[PDB]
């Protein structure tokens, strides 16, 4: 129940990785969803690949 803008997160250089599966990051502005869920946790750097 909100307006999302994924260009801010995408252009930001602060992220170590930004990998999209199924989609790709510049198309996210013209697409919309019934819901989006954010799974948030801390891992070890070498575990990012997992």
């Amino acid at each position: 129940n909100c307006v999302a803008d994924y260009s801010v997160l995408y252009n930001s250089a602060s992220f170590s990785t930004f990998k999209c599966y199924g989609v790709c990051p510049t198309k996210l502005n013209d697409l919309c969803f019934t819901n989006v869920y954010a799974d948030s946790f801390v891992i070890r750097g070498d575990e990012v690949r997992q």
């Binding site: 252009n11 250089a13 990051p25 510049t26």
Partner: protein, 49 residues
């Protein structure tokens, strides 16, 4: 620096064709271009419309 890649350089300063034929050659230059006080003579385009 590869076909199909995006980012602030891939989009603003150096874009390759996705049908690129050729080779990408790279080596570190930490003992030549970097300087104490930093080397600020190398500029990149942070933002473009």
């Amino acid at each position: 620096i590869a076909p199909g890649q995006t980012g602030k350089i891939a989009d603003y300063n150096y874009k390759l064709p996705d049908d690129f034929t050729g080779c990408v050659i790279a080596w570190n230059s930490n003992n030549l271009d970097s300087k104490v006080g930093g080397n600020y003579n190398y500029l990149y385009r942070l933002f473009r419309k």
